[PDB]
Amino acid sequence: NPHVAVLAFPFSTHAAPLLAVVRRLAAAAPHAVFSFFSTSQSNASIFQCNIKSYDISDGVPEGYVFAGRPQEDIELFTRAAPESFRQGMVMAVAETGRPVSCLVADAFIWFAADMAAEMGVAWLPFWTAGPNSLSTHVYIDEIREKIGVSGIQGREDELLNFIPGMSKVRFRDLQEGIVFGNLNSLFSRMLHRMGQVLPKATAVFINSFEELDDSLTNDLKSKLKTYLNIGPFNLITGCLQWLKERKPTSVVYISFGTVTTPPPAEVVALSEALEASRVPFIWSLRDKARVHLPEGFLEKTRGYGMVVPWAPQAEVLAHEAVGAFVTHCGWNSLWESVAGGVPLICRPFFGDQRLNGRMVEDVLEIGVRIEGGVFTKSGLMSCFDQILSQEKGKKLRENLRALRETADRAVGPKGSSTENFITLVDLVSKPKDV
Ligand SMILES: O=c1ccn([C@@H]2O[C@H](COP(=O)(O)OP(=O)(O)O)[C@@H](O)[C@H]2O)c(=O)[nH]1
């Protein structure tokens, strides 16, 4: 009888959505036991009696002094991860007296495919982001072949139209590690390999819906053995008190997810735009970053806006008082804004965020871009006006309503995501081959 090993990626918003799916799987397959592996800090943060969490090593050696490189924690985790997860799984097998029958893992868990092969079990990677970024990873060699790896200077606005479903994607929209950025880094090489091995998975599953882009869906089904859209998850499953008192569609919510803050000059520009427009606001800003706020900003905005280290974001976005979302365009944030019917103001930083920005602005038309890709005072005030007071916002809100309805049908009875989820339950329910 099944024992599903679940290997979480413990940085950014990766472990939470994975746990979210595992909970649905555990309810759907009550006879299967689920062992959820992440770091202790990740597990404490994110946490069905058939699920048990196991803390695995963060990969940091006992006396280690950090160099202070960016994503040094991520490198240390990744290098040790194969062995960290192995030791966790040994523990879980011993506790349950059940061999692992299925390996579910974040697609960023490098070597999960090899671990599953060695154990003789199915590999079911979860892509936590959008099919746009899934597509470009799976086509990394073709993209590199076509564009080259010596840079894109003078070609930033050229179109990725040779890749199915990517006609609106520009060269500059690509993730770091594809054709620009540090192509030789550990993160780049691992991502490169991931893209190459994903076609060998039993099934790749994703928090999205097929009808988001039928051509992209068809293309990915052609590149992968089995490809299963099972979302949007969020349509399946004092901030609020303050919002209660605000006019409909009048509040700007600002957040950059779990690991990103804009640079100090952009923190300033945002504070100036909020002040000059006097737009009511809730700004999720790391407390440490408050040092970058201009003297007097908090005092002058106290009567109409709040700066908090953490907001109940999905609930805020669902609140009738919210009229716009200034976002880094992370995948989970985008779908929560769609659930709430709130137009985006896009300021992507890295990873898949530019692709998501492009999707929002140019494909779905549910948000606006910031001219220059950086916060300026006047640029932000224009976005606030366009969305909150002008016809553009009315159109974006209409686009959001139609998009949400499609998404809702995908997760309804007989929906594409509902049917795909049945397929995935069937896969994780399968005992280990004899
Ligand atoms: O103040 C905050 C900031 C973010 N989030 C949650 O953090 C997640 C951000 O996910 P995303 O994919 O957008 O960005 P990431 O954190 O991975 O960069 C979302 O579920 C947000 O609702 C939140 O609850 N409160």
Side-chain angles (χ1 to χ4, degrees):
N1 253 162
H3 175 195
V4 179
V6 184
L7 316 184
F9 178 79
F11 308 96
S12 287
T13 306
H14 277 77
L18 184 53
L19 181 56
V21 193
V22 166
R23 291 195 188 290
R24 297 165 55 200
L25 291 171
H31 63 296
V33 302
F34 290 85
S35 295
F36 194 90
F37 303 95
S38 198
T39 67
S40 65
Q41 325 81 290
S42 168
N43 279 334
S45 184
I46 69 180
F47 287 96
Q48 298 79 30
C49 306
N50 56 333
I51 304 163
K52 187 173 181 185
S53 67
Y54 294 83
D55 298 343
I56 52 70
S57 174
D58 62 9
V60 178
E62 225 106 275
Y64 185 90
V65 180
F66 279 80
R69 294 184 272 99
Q71 287 161 351
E72 197 174 340
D73 53 6
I74 304 190
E75 292 169 45
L76 285 160
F77 173 81
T78 304
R79 287 213 160 100
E83 184 68 24
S84 296
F85 284 127
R86 193 193 60 78
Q87 302 182 200
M89 288 186 286
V90 170
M91 180 169 307
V93 175
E95 290 182 9
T96 61
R98 288 199 179 177
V100 172
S101 57
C102 188
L103 191 57
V104 169
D106 195 299
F108 282 179
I109 294 315
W110 299 303
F111 287 135
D114 314 273
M115 297 182 82
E118 197 49 39
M119 296 164 75
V121 302
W123 172 44
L124 307 164
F126 179 36
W127 188 259
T128 78
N132 48 2
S133 58
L134 175 59
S135 174
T136 68
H137 282 289
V138 169
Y139 281 107
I140 184 167
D141 294 321
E142 296 89 334
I143 294 160
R144 283 183 178 185
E145 272 144 24
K146 275 48 130 201
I147 303 177
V149 293
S150 61
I152 55 156
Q153 301 82 340
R155 295 193 291 158
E156 299 89 354
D157 287 327
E158 298 199 1
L159 294 172
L160 235 238
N161 52 17
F162 61 85
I163 306 286
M166 301 300 139
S167 57
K168 302 202 194 299
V169 176
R170 317 205 200 259
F171 285 14
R172 65 158 81 247
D173 300 336
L174 295 165
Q175 313 100 118
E176 293 81 1
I178 305 288
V179 293
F180 61 76
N182 183 359
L183 263 54
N184 211 94
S185 74
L186 171 74
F187 202 51
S188 291
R189 293 176 178 270
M190 289 297 87
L191 260 3
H192 184 188
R193 206 224 317 125
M194 175 190 72
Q196 292 182 331
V197 182
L198 283 161
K200 303 160 139 292
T202 300
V204 182
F205 67 93
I206 187 170
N207 180 13
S208 190
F209 63 107
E210 289 186 354
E211 297 88 350
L212 178 64
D213 179 328
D214 294 321
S215 305
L216 179 56
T217 292
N218 291 348
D219 192 56
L220 289 163
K221 287 178 161 175
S222 85
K223 289 278 272 173
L224 302 172
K225 289 187 185 157
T226 297
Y227 171 60
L228 301 172
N229 280 256
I230 54 151
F233 293 175
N234 68 133
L235 299 185
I236 303 167
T237 310
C239 283
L240 300 196
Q241 298 86 312
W242 189 91
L243 250 6
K244 187 174 179 291
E245 299 308 313
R246 267 67 202 173
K247 286 324 296 298
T249 333
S250 70
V251 176
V252 175
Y253 172 72
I254 305 114
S255 181
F256 311 97
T258 57
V259 290
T260 310
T261 298
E266 288 188 69
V267 167
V268 172
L270 180 56
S271 73
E272 288 177 342
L274 293 174
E275 184 187 359
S277 62
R278 302 181 183 171
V279 68
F281 66 87
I282 297 167
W283 185 354
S284 179
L285 179 63
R286 306 278 213 98
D287 277 340
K288 292 286 183 181
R290 295 173 76 103
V291 303
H292 301 304
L293 296 171
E295 197 173 346
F297 170 77
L298 293 168
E299 290 89 340
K300 283 180 294 185
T301 59
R302 190 163 31 210
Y304 60 91
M306 287 190 56
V307 186
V308 298
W310 190 252
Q313 171 173 307
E315 289 161 284
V316 167
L317 287 169
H319 195 289
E320 61 273 17
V322 177
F325 179 19
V326 182
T327 180
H328 71 321
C329 308
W331 191 251
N332 303 98
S333 288
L334 201 164
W335 295 94
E336 298 165 0
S337 203
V338 173
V342 175
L344 297 313
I345 298 165
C346 307
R347 170 38 184 119
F349 288 78
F350 30 65
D352 69 331
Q353 293 161 17
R354 286 179 305 279
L355 293 167
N356 295 349
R358 185 70 58 194
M359 185 196 59
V360 165
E361 297 153 16
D362 291 354
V363 176
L364 302 173
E365 300 188 329
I366 54 173
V368 299
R369 74 177 231 283
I370 50 167
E371 315 259 308
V374 295
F375 292 160
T376 64
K377 173 185 196 345
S378 56
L380 280 167
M381 297 176 71
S382 182
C383 294
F384 299 159
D385 181 58
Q386 289 166 46
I387 292 180
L388 301 172
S389 301
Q390 310 296 335
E391 175 66 27
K392 179 66 136 206
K394 299 183 71 174
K395 292 199 222 86
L396 305 183
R397 284 181 259 282
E398 283 216 332
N399 295 345
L400 285 154
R401 283 188 270 275
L403 180 65
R404 193 179 51 202
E405 175 62 27
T406 301
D408 279 336
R409 283 176 200 207
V411 306
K414 167 86 147 188
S416 56
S417 289
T418 304
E419 301 277 8
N420 289 332
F421 188 76
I422 290 168
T423 300
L424 182 66
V425 170
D426 287 350
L427 290 161
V428 311
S429 284
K430 284 183 46 179
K432 194 182 173 166
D433 289 358
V434 297

